[PDB]
């Protein structure tokens, strides 16, 4: 179903609050994003990890140069956090992603996997900044 | 759902500070920050 898959969808507004928070390769790795390719067609890709691009760009108020190593079945390349869209996974794009996964052979993640992964973002959002992370964030 | 927004001292940038947290700006890092105007009905009489 698309409604259940949209739960872990990392919109463009949420990613602005973890631009420098540690454990970014742990809480982010596992969720899906609606990266815009470009005309209105979108392709869902899996978050394999985290990379850093040599180009610095401004995203509204803040500004980040980190990239995002995504992959859609087999086709993989470097992307940016600025092309991500805030729209939810439509039926057509959901079917396209399912077909791409079936063709690539990657087993679809289990519903319990998504159920236990969606809580990661929720628990990270209310995380108290009691440790020595503000120094690194400001740096 | 009010995280008690504050205003940095010199940055004049908004910050979200919750209880049991250090008082510092999200960037640079200073130790001074003021509050924002209330949302109440501040109504004066031009007298």
């Amino acid at each position: 179903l698309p409604e259940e898959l949209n739960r872990v969808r990392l919109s463009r507004h949420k990613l602005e609050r973890w631009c420098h928070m540690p454990f970014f390769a742990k809480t982010v790795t596992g969720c899906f994003v609606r990266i815009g390719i470009g005309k209105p067609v979108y392709r869902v890709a899996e978050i394999t990890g985290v990379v850093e691009t040599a180009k610095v760009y401004q995203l509204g108020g803040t500004r980040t140069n980190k990239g995002l190593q995504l992959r859609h079945g087999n086709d993989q390349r470097v992307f940016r956090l600025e092309f991500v869209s805030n729209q939810e996974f439509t039926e057509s794009e959901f079917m396209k992603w399912k077909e791409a996964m079936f063709s690539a052979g990657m087993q679809l993640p289990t519903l319990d996997e998504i159920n236990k992964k969606e809580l990661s973002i929720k628990e990270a959002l209310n995380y108290k900044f009691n440790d020595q992370d503000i120094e690194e964030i400001v740096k | 759902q009010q995280p008690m927004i504050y205003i940095c001292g010199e940055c004049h940038t908004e910050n979200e500070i919750k209880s049991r947290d250090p008082i510092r700006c999200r960037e640079c890092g200073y130790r001074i920050m003021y509050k924002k105007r209330t949302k109440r009905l501040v109504v004066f009489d031009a007298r």
């Binding site: 919109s11 463009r12 507004h13 990266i35 390719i37 470009g38 940016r80 600025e82 092309f83 | 759902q1």
Partner: peptide, 17 residues
């Protein structure tokens, strides 16, 4: 205050660049 999208702010594309 999770995501005040209200759509969005014109999301750029990859091939457009």
């Amino acid at each position: 205050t999770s995501t005040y999208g209200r759509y969005g702010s014109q999301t750029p594309m990859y091939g457009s660049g």
